[PDB]
Amino acid sequence: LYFQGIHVLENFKNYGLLLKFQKLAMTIIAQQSNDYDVEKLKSTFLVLDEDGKGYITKEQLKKGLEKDGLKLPYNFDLLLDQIDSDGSGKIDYTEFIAAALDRKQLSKKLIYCAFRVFDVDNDGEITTAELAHILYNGNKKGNITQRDVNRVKRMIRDVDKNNDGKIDFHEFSEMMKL
Amino acid sequence: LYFQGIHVLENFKNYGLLLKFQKLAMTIIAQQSNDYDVEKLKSTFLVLDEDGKGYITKEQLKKGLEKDGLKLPYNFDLLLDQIDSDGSGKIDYTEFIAAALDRKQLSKKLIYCAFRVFDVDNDGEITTAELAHILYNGNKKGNITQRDVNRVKRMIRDVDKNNDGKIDFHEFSEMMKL
Ligand SMILES: [Ca+2]
Ligand SMILES: [Ca+2]
Ligand SMILES: [Ca+2]
Ligand SMILES: [Ca+2]
Ligand SMILES: [Ca+2]
Ligand SMILES: [Ca+2]
């Protein structure tokens, strides 16, 4: 059934975009926060990434943690598959941050650091057009289509709490924190 | 560094458990809700699962959606890797539900359906011991260790909003919904 298929596919697309949105927020925090604890995790990643690739193999991650003196869970391979959230087979910087930087540790300041990038115009509200340009252009400027805007609108609907079609700081924080 | 490694590993374990907790909640909703919209998604999965295995290959999912008349995104393979959240290579029932059943569509009734399973004793609060027994024993009864309880405690800390070490309905709903 087609009609049912439509809603299924669109929900799938939404699931993926929401994952992308949170991972990009985490990456923005790692790049822009200047927070000591975050910087120290970035130092760990530097140590693990022994070839300077920007990503680490599952072997490198295991060996690197073992070199620290840790006893890994026997089920660590399943965990590594979960950390590899894009399924590429390797753990990139963004995935390492997104699993190692506990959401609980994200203070208001850290979450604001990401919020203010998505809120391009700094009015306190992330709009569909702002979010689409960050996700699809990487920056404030550039071409996006009404289909793109509609896709992002559907994703705002999952985060919005006051039915205004925009994401405020509170709403954003409730997405970032469980 | 060992000390830093410890906190990294424990955060990784937490990330994985939180994913497990949400996916199990979704599965409980699919099994126990008796909600028409959820039942209709379950009918879709039955159609896709043509060999009656309980899981579908990426090919089966693509072909099945194409048979519905849908135009899949050219990047659907990346999406499928994201849906395959355990990295097994195939999409099981639980993953299909967890991506197709939009969180937005989870009414109070649907979320309560999962809540009351984790709140084994029905006192309105999910405790560490209750959650550990559901995650590790599958049911209320059975052996778990203090290490197990400590692992679950660390995960409650990510969901708790009033510092009581227990998860109430509101807190649970804030985990389930973005
Ligand atoms: Ca990856
Ligand atoms: Ca704005
Ligand atoms: Ca809003
Ligand atoms: Ca799978
Ligand atoms: Ca209870
Ligand atoms: Ca609580």
From Swiss-Prot, chains A, B:
Region of interest (J domain), ranges: 11-46
Chain ranges of the EF-hand domain: 36-71, 71-105, 106-141, 147-178
Taxonomic superkingdom: Eukaryota
Residues binding Ca(2+) 1: 84, 86, 88, 90, 95
Short sequence motif named J domain EF-hand interaction motif, residue ranges: 20-29
UniProt subcellular location: Cytoplasm
Record-listed Ca(2+) 3 binding positions: 160, 162, 164, 166, 171
Cystine residue pairs: none
Protein name: Calcium-dependent protein kinase 3
Function description: Calcium-dependent protein kinase which acts as a sensor and effector of intracellular Ca(2+) levels probably in part downstream of cGMP-activated PKG kinase. In the mosquito midgut, regulates the gliding motility of the ookinete which is essential for the ookinete to invade the midgut epithelium. However, another study showed that while required for ookinete invasion of the midgut epithelium, is not required for ookinete gliding motility.
Motif (J domain autoinhibitory motif): 11-19
Binding-site list for Ca(2+) 2: 119, 121, 123, 125, 130
Domain notes for this protein: The EF-hand domain 1 cannot bind calcium due to the presence of a Lys instead of an Asp at position 435 and a Gln instead of a Glu at position 442 preventing calcium binding. The EF-hand domains 3 and 4 probably bind calcium constitutively when calcium levels are low, while the EF-hand domain 2 binds calcium following an increase in calcium levels.
Family: Belongs to the protein kinase superfamily. Ser/Thr protein kinase family. CDPK subfamily.
Gene field: CDPK3
